[PDB]
Design a protein around this ligand. Sequence first.
Ligand SMILES: [Mg+2]
Ligand SMILES: [Mg+2]
Lengths: 177, 315, 93, 52, 1113
Amino acid sequence: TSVYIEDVLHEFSTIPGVKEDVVEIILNLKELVVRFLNPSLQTVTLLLKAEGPKEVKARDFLPVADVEIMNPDLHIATLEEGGRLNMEVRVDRGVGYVPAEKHGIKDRINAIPVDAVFSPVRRVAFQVEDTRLGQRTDLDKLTLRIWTDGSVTPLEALNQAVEILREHLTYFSNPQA
Amino acid sequence: YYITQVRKEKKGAGLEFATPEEALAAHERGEVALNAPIKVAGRETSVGRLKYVFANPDEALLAVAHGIVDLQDVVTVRYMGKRLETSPGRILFARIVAEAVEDEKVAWELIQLDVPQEKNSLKDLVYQAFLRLGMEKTARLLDALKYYGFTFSTTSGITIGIDDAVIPEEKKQYLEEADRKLLQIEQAYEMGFLTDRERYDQILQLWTETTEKVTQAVFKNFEENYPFNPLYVMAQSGARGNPQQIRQLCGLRGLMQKPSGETFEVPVRSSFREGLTVLEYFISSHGARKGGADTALRTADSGYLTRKLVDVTHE
Amino acid sequence: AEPGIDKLFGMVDSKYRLTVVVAKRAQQLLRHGFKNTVLEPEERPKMQTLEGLFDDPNAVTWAMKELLTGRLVFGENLVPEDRLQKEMERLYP
Amino acid sequence: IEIVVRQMMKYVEVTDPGDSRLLEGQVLEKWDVEALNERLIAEGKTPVAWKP
Amino acid sequence: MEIKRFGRIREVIPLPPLTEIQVESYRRALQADVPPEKRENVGIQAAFRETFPIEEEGLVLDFLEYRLGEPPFPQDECREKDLTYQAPLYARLQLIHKDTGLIKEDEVFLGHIPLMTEDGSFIINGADRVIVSQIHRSPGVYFTPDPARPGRYIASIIPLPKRGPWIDLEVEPNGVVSMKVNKRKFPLVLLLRVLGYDQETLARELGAYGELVQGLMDESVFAMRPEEALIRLFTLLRPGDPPKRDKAVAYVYGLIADPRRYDLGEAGRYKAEEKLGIRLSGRTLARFEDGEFKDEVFLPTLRYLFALTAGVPGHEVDDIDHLGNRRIRTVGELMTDQFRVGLARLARGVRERMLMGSEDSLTPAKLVNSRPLEAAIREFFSRSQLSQFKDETNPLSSLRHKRRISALGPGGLTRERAGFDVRDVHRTHYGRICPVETPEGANIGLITSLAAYARVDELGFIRTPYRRVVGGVVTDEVVYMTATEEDRYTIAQANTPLEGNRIAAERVVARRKGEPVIVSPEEVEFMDVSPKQVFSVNTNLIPFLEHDDANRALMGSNMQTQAVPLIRAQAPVVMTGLEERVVRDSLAALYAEEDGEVAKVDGNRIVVRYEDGRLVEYPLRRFYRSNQGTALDQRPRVVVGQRVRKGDLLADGPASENGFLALGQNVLVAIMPFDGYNFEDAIVISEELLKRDFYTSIHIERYEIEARDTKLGPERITRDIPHLSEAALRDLDEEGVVRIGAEVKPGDILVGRTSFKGESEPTPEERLLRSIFGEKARDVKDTSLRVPPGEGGIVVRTVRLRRGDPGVELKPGVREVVRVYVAQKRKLQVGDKLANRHGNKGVVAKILPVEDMPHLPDGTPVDVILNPLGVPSRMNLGQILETHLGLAGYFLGQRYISPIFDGAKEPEIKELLAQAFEVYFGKRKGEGFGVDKREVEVLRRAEKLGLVTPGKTPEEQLKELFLQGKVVLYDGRTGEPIEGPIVVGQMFIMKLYHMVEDKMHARSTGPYSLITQQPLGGKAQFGGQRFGEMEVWALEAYGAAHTLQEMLTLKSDDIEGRNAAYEAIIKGEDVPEPSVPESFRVLVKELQALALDVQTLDEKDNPVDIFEGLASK
DNA sequence: GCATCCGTGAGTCGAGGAAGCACAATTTAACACTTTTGTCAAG
DNA sequence: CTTGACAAAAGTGTTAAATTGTGCTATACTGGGAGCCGTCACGGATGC
Ligand SMILES: [Mg+2]
Ligand SMILES: [Mg+2]
C-alpha cells in the first residue's frame, strides 16, 4: 500500500547506482506476494537494506513474525557498485482494488502510495460436464478451477466464497411492507 | 431484428405426409428439420408448429428458458384469443410493446407481427404510437425498445470475422465471362469494326454490368445460404451498411475514376477480403481524395446557403 | 417526458401559452413562498432528501401539477395586473 | 420550400405609376403596392400598374 | 517470444535516412565544415557572392570568406534558459579604395545562425521547432492551352518566388504576340527589337511555321533603333516618369537582366534548357553586356509557342501539377532565401553609409550594420508559417513532422484559394508522395507526406528508386529518377513473380505514364523496389493495409502520431517491419557506437568501455517534458559487464520496447455488442487493464510566474502572503516556492507572490469594518500562483532564473522568474480516446470489473469489447485479420511481421490457427476435461448458422470455428454462453493524446472582455462557451424567447443585468428582467464615430436614451 | 450586347496569449512654515 | 457635556533641481521603392 525509499521524494525519480527508476520499482513491488500467518494481523512494514552490486530479490526483506513471502525470487531492483537501496514497504490487508488516489496511505512524509490489488485469486474457471446417474441422463457435473497467488489456498478461497454467498442469502428475510 | 427473424430449414423441405403423427415421427428419425416447410395433409406447415403448441406466451417463453425451443423457431401460440403460428421471439416483441404502452389491445394494433422488425417497421411503430398515445407513452416505448434491443444484441452472438465476408462462387464465373467478352471486344477493335470511343464505352458497360451481377450474386448467396450472416443482417435490418459497401467487402471493388473524371479501363477486380494490389490501391486513392475534397468544399457552400435562407425568411 | 404533458398541451390553443402560464404561476408561487398553492397537503410535490421527504423546491414543478388539477384560471384581461398583485399580497402576506 | 419561395416572389416592379408618386421601374413590395392601390381606388384615382 | 516473418519480396536497398530531407538540405546551405576555398556556389555562400561586391560607383566592399563559430551554449542550456541554439557568423570583408587602390580587411561579426540539431530540428527561444518543406510550382517556361479560345496556347516564364515578375506570351486574335508583365500588356515586338533582333532574323528563325511569323513582322518599330525602342518600352511599362536612357535602361536591366533582381534558379534554368533545347549561360531572361541587351530565352520561348500552335510532332503542353513540374523547397533553401533578403538589406545600408561620413577613413566594420540580416533570420525561425512548433507527442510524431510537405506558407497557395487540382492525387505522386496520409478537413491535399523511399534531389524534385530490368532479368542496379524521367519507361510491379532474378510471369502488370497495362517480360525496363515506396512512414506501419479502405487508413496513420508514451508500452503483436527503423532514425533510443563492454549502468547514465579503450558516458534523458506535456525518458536496457556490438541497443526512448516502436498495449479483444456501451464507436474495457497499469501515462505541466519592478514597488516571491493560514502555506518552503515532492490540487499555492496595492481610498463600508475589528489595511496583496481547476499532481522540479544569471536574458523590469513542474500519472478512464492502426477509434464509456467481462472457457477474461457494427460501413477489414493472427499468436506465444501488400494471407493465418488450437484445446484434454455442456449448445446453433459442418464431433466443430477466428465465449454475469461464436483475438490499441481530463471545463462567472464586456473564451482563460448564430437560430426555432434573451443579456454583456442576476440567485430570488446589452451600446457609438445619427425611438417616435443620461451634455 | 473591370462572398464549436548642443521654460521635489485634526487628560 | 494642552496630520509657500520644449548649425547635395505571384462565383457599372 505504501513504500518509502530513503533519499527519494516522489516516484518520478531515479536513484544513484540503481538501474530502475522508482516507477519501475513500484511496479515490481505490486507483484510481491505476502502471506500473513496471523488472522488478526492487519498491517506490516518490510525493511530492505541493500548495497551494490547485487540483484535485490524479495528474499532480501528482513524477516518479520507471522509474515511469509510467497515469491522470494521476485526481482525488485538491480544495484550497481556504489548504489544503495534502503526502503520500507507497507503491506496491508483488504478486499478489491483501491487506487493510490483513494487510500493515499503514507507512513511518513516522503512515502509513496501504491495502488492496491488485494484479491488473492488470480483466475477462476468452472466446467459443466454431462454426467448420468441411474436412468436420468441430463444431470450436471460441476468442476471449479481456482488459481491463487499462494497466500490463500484455493480451498480457503472457495470456503470464503461459499460463506459470503450463504451470508447474502440470509438477507432475503425479515420482509418489510 | 435478431429475435423477430425466423429460422428456415432445408433438411425436410418438401416431404408430404398423411397425418401429423407420421410427420412428427420422421422428425425424431432426423429426416426433417423443425422449421423445414412440409405438407402434413393438404396444408403446408412445419414440425415445430405441430410439435409445440403453447397455451399462452408465458408457457412459450418458459420453454425457451429451458432450452426446448429457440426464439427463432416457428411454433403455435395462443395469444389474445387467436391460435397464432409465430416464433417465441415475435411473441416476446409483442409483449414488449404491450407492457411499454400498458395496453394489450392497442399494442396489438401497432405492430406487424409477421415480419422481422427492421428500421422502417420500427419507425412506423413509433409514429403510430405517437398518434394513438402521445409523447409520454411513446417515450416510454422508446425506452423499452432501447433496453431490449441492447439486451438481445449482446447475447445474440453478432460478430464480424474474415470468413463472414462470403465470396460467391459466381464471381469467378462472371470474371471469366467478362474476360472473354473483353477479349472479344479487343478482337473486333483490331478488325476496325468500332472506334476508340465506342470501344471505351463498351468496356465501361461490360464492367458496369458485371459489377451489378456480382452484387446480386453476393446478396443472393446471403439470403439462401447465410440468412443470419452478420453483414447480411446489418444491411437487411438497416443497422449498418448498404449493398454497395457489402459488394466491395465480398465481391469486387469495381471501376475507379481518374483525377480528370475518366474511369480506368481496368477495374479493381478484388474485394477487401482478398486484398488489393499496390497499383489497385493507388488507383483507388484518386476517388478517395476527390470525395474528401468535395466534402470539405461542400460544407462551406451548404453553411453559406443556410445563412442566406435564414436571413431571407427569419421574419 | 413531463408528467401529464399531453394533457397540458391539450388545455391551451398555443403551446407557447402553456409556457407563459406555467412560468408566471411559478413566479407567483416563489414570490409568496408557496403559501398560495391550490394543491392540497397530500398533493404537494416532494423531494427525497437524506433527512427525509421535503417539499419540492422547484416552482416550475409545482405550477405544472397545479395546472393539471384544473383549479387555476388563465386567460387575457382576467383582472388588472396592479389589482391582482395587491389582492394576492393581502390574501398571502 | 414554399415559405422560402414566397419570399423570393415578394417584390414587384412599377410599370405605370398612375395617380401616385411611384416611378416607373421602381421596385417595391407587393403588399405595399396592393395597399396603395386599394387606397387610391377608394378615392377614385387610377391605381398603380405593377409587374411580378 | 519468437518472431515469425511473412513475405516473398526481397528488398534490394534499405530505407534511406528518414530525416535526411532536413539534415542534408541544411548542411549544404551552411557548408560549415567544407574549407572556405572548397565551398561551392550554393547555400549562404551563393548569397554572399550574389550581393557582394557592394560598389558605390570609388569604394568597393568585397566578400572573401565566412566562418561559423562554436555555439555559445549547448542545446540543453538553451532549452533551460529560453535561448536559441545558434553559431556566430563572421564574414571576412575587404574595403578597397578605387582611387587610392588601398585594401583594408577585417572580420565583421554578422550575427547568429540557428543550428539544426542531430535529429533535424531547431531550438528557437528554448522551443523545439521544425521547418516544413514547401511544394510550389517549379521555375521555367511552361506552355498551357488558352481556355477561352481553343487551339491557342500561352507561354509562361516563371522565376524563383519573389525573384522577378511572371511573363506571359500570347498570340492575340489580331495575330500580334502580346507580352504581359506586371499586369501590363504590350507587343513583344518592342521588347524583341530592344534585344537587337532584326526583321530578317525573325524571318529566318520563326518564319517556318505559317502566318504566325507574319503577325510578328510589324516594320513600324523594326526600323526604330534599339535605344528608341527601349525608351518606347520604358514609357509603356511605367507611364509618367521622365523618359531618360539612364532611367530607361536601368528599369529594363533590373526587370529581366539584373541577376540580383531576376533569378530563374538552378532548377528553372535546368527546366528551361530541357524544354526549349537550349543552353542558358546564366539564370536571367536576357543579358546586358557591352552596353547592349542580349536575348537569352525570349526567342527560344517564342519559337516553341509558334511550333506548338502550328502542330509539330515534338511539342506539347505542360501539366502544371505533374510532379516533374513541382519542386520542394527544403529548410536549407527556405533559410537561404531569408538570408539573401536580409543580406540585401545589409547591402542597402552599406551603400547609404559609404556615401556619407569620413569617406577616406572607412573600414568594413563601420560600414556593416548586421541588424537587418539578424532581423530577417530571426523572423524566419520565429514568425514563419513553415516554422512550426515541433510535434513530439512520441518519437513517430517528430519523425512525421520533419517529412511533411506543405503547399501553404509565404510563396504558396491559400487555404481557401486552392482548387481540386492542387488537392488531387496526381499519377506522378506514385512513389513520391503518400496518397493516403493527409489532414482530413480544410487542409486535405494541401499537407502531404514524403513517401518512404523518396528523396529530394539537388534541384528540389522528388525521385524514387527503380530496379533496372534487362532482357527479362531484374538486376540489383537501383536508379533514382524523377517523374519526368519516369514517363519514358515501362515499369513493372514489385510483386511480379521472379524465378531467382528472371521474370517468371508471362503477363506482367506495369505502368506507362501512370496507366496500368499488361506487357511481356521483354517489354519491362524497370521494377518497383517494394510496395513500401508508395506510402509514407506512418502508412507503412499499418499491417494488412491492402484490406483497409483508404478513408480509414488516412485516420489510422494520422492517429499513430497522437499516441502517448506509456510506462508499460508494448510493440504490436503484428508488425510490418518498419518499427525498428523508426526508433533507430528518431534518435530517441541509445545505441553502441562500436563493439565494447558496459562498465556502469544506472537510471541516469551508462558508461561503455569500447574496444579502443576510450570510456564514453551517455547521460539518459529522464522525465523530460516534451512540447505536448508528455514525459520523455530513456530507460537502460543493459547490465554492467554486458558485451555490446556496434549498433546494439543501450536504452529505450519514449514509446519503444527493446528498440521496437511501442505506441500502445496488446490486449485481448472480443468483437461483439455489449449492452449498448459499445454504441456508436464507444469502447468497453476491463478493470484488469487498470490493475496492471496498461494505458498509464506520465504527463508534466509547467507553471511560470514572474516578479517584476513596478511603480508602486517591486513584486516579491515570498512565503509571507497576507491573510493566509498555515494550512495554505504548509508546502511552501522559506523561499516561498512549493517544495519538491508535494502533491498539489486545484486551488493550492505553487509560488507565493505579493504585489503592492495601488493607492485607492477604500469604500466606507470596508473602512468601518476595519475600524470595528481594529485591523489596519496592508500595503501588499496576494498575487501568488495557484493550481488551476482540474489540474495538479506531484511537484518534480522548480527552476529559478534571476537577473544577471549567465545566459539569462530576462525582459526589462523582470526581477526573476520561477517555473514549477508538476507531474501526474494518468490511468485510463471513461472519456479517454483509444484507437488501433486501422482507423477504428473511440472513447472509453464503461470500465467493467473482471467478473463482468466475457471470458474464455479456460477462465480468461477479455480486455476490450469492440462493436462489430463499426466494420461494415468503414470497410477496414485489416483489423479483423490482425485480430485473427493475434489470437493465434496469443496461444503460440509468438509475434509476426507481415509487410504491407506482401505478408500474411488467410491460408497461412489458418495454418497458424490450427496449431494454436492444439495448444489451446490440447491443453484442456490433458488436464482431464472434455467438451462443456455450454459449448455443445453453442455448437448446435453454429451448425444452424452454417458455421460448422454437420455430423462431426464437438472437437472437430470447435476447431472449425477456431480456424475462423471464433471461440465459444461465456457471459461473466450469467455464466451462460453467448448464443453464437465470437471473434476473439489480440489487437494493438493506442491511448491517444485526446483526454477528457484536459477538455472538461465549466464556468459560472469569470473574466470579461475589454470593449464588448462579454465573457472571454478558452479553458485557459476560464472563458465561457460561444453561443454563435446557429445556436441562436435553434432557440428561435424552439420559440424560447426568454431563454434566448437571458444568454444575450444576463449571461453575456448586460453589466447591470448580470450583477443583479448573481445577487438575486445567492439571495434565493428569481433573476430580474434584462436590460440593453453593452454590445449594442458599443455599436451605436461606433456608428456615431462614422458620422451616422443612430437613434432609438419609442412608440411615439420620441428619442429614448439608452445611455442613462451619461452621454447627454 | 458586350466584354472588362471592380467589389463582395465563400460552415460551426475547440485550441493555440540613425545628431548634438545650447538655452529657455515648465514641472517635480524638498524643504520650510502655519493650520487643521485627533487626542488626551482633566474639569 | 466642555476645556484647555498636546501631537501628528495636513496644507501653503518658496526654491532648486530635474525634466521638457525649442531654435540652430553656411562647400554643395534638387523626381521613390517594392511588388513580382495557381479561385470561382456572381451582380453592377460603364467603355462604348
Ligand atoms: Mg498481489
Ligand atoms: Mg405437442
